[PDB]
Amino acid sequence: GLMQFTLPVRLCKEIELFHFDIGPFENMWPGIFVYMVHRSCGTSCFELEKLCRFIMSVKKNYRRVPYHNWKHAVTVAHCMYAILQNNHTLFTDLERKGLLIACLCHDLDHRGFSNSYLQKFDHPLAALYSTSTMEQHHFSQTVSILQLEGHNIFSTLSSSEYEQVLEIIRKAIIATDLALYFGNRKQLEEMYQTGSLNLNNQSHRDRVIGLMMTACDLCSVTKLWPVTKLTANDIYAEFWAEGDEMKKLGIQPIPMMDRDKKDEVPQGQLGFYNAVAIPCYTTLTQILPPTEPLLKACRDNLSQWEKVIRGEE
């Protein structure tokens, strides 16, 4: 009950900033997550015994792939912690509870392959979940872990709070399917600009939480340049493996996934910042003004990829 996690001084300070990197020490990541849940939610939100057992089972169900791994899960959870901490009064108790868990679980059992590759391979998950294939799997895996003896961190919720929190998590995890982000953002953009955006309207809140999920999921583009540039290597390591696996099915992959087309990456990065990242953090910042540091960092990284193209690095 009276047992806080405490971090060394430098982490205690920098964990509060959007651009925090969780570090190369894997054994500190469970503690960093519990710290964030205690400050975001409270010491009371979860039985520590049950939370620790949940965290360790989630970690076991992330695979040893270059990007869609345990480090990504915790990184995406930290970006949500920082949004939630800078927007204290906008979010219910259930939402703070659900959203940190959803971010931790949102890529559970990822194999390093897109929804597209599962469909072309004719993977069994693609027959079972014809859209948002991996994300429906990630939610399926979150529910399975929650039902292991000892792992039900929501045990002290009432029956209807429990239904609400699993519904928050389901929607939050489905929204990390980037194919859905484009229309979600367009709708939020119209709503904000015509002044119809209403955070008491559940369907509106759902959309705002979806955009928060995309912003957290993409948050490697909001880090200091050296972190963003080194993370891009892991992201492309997966893309190029999937490219190779497309060529093995006798499909020419898109250039982004072709390791023979590495020279095209810096221009690919501009496309990605201008069509996905910048607009995501721009709309987020219009809806949640204190998340402006994520947009400012994203703009700095765009300017760094511009320098790469101009051979200034």
Ligand SMILES: CCO[C@H](C(=O)NNCc1cc(OC)c(Br)c(OC)c1)c1ccc(N2CCOCC2)cc1
């Ligand atoms: C099967 C690949 O699909 C990915 C995806 O669904 N997510 N991409 C995530 C991603 C994250 C990221 O950093 C956190 C970086 Br850097 C990144 O780099 C490309 C991609 C995707 C990549 C580029 C686009 N373009 C981009 C150009 O405009 C249309 C959409 C659309 C989808």
Ligand SMILES: [Mg+2]
């Ligand atoms: Mg995902």
Ligand SMILES: [Zn+2]
């Ligand atoms: Zn993710």
